[PDB]
DNA sequence: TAATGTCAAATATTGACA
DNA sequence: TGTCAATATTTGACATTA
């Protein structure tokens, strides 16, 4: 991952900067998981899960999708909510090989 | 009937810690001895009046294909401008 | 087995809708 | 208050190398 990372940041919401900074040392800077885990006082399992979060977030949402923050009646708030689930579901089974 | 000036002073005091002082909801909750659910609803009433939308309305932030993203972006419009019509004409249920 | 990375389970906290 | 999902974490086990 190069400047592809810096383009993943919007979709890297819900994660913190340390979780993002840490995974960037691995995916872009080429550092090792176990090395940075010792650098920032962490289990090597967390740094595994940290990047896997950053990585999966890439596969979960294509860069074409748009981020929309909207206030709705409770009836229709579930609809858009549920349709994103069905929309992420449809992207998910395409990853297959 | 106004909406921001309608609320109890404590809610505006609670919500000021969250939104202005940057404090967390659970923080001000334990600070003023209330549940973290009460502070969430307390703040929400402020954000819904500042959003001039119904209080029962729920926010939804979501990633969606652009086709369906303009679909939902239109729903907010056909809701903001739906209640806007119900306020002046439902009194004409005569 | 030393070293790394992943799968797994399980903890605490927050902020959401009921 | 109950509950859930998503964070922030942990140890333990385990496949895989050199």
Residue numbers in the entry:
A (entry chain B): 2 to 98
B (entry chain A): 10 to 103
From the paper:
ArdK is a 102 amino acid protein encoded by the broad host range conjugative plasmid R388. In R388, ArdK represses the expression of five genes by its binding to their respective promoters (PardC, Porf7, Pssb, Porf12 and Porf14). The KorA family of transcriptional regulators includes plasmid-borne repressors involved in plasmid stability and conjugation. Our structural analyses show that ArdK, a member of this family, can form a symmetric dimer similar to that observed for KorA, yet it binds direct sequence repeats as a non-symmetric dimer.
To study the structural changes involved in this alternative binding mode, we obtained the crystal structure of ArdK bound to an IR with an n = 3 loop, as described in the Materials and Methods. Strikingly, the IR–ArdK complex did not show any significant structural change compared with the DR–ArdK structure previously obtained. Despite the palindromic structure of the operator, the protein binds in a head-to-tail configuration. Furthermore, a close inspection of the DNA–protein contacts indicated that the DNA–protein interface was formed by the same amino acids. The –35 box was again recognized by the rotating HTH motif, while the fixed HTH recognized the same GC base pair. The structure revealed the reason why ArdK was able to recognize that particular IR configuration: the n = 3 loop maintained the adventitious TGxCA repeat at the same distance as in its cognate DR architecture. Bases located in between were different, but these were only contacted through their sugar backbone. Thus, although the operator had an apparent palindromic structure, it was contacted and recognized as a degenerate DR. The distance between the IR arms was necessary to situate the bases specifically recognized by each HTH domain (a GC pair) at the same distance as in the DR configuration. The results thus demonstrate that a TF may recognize operators with a DR or IR apparent topology without changes in the DNA binding mechanism.
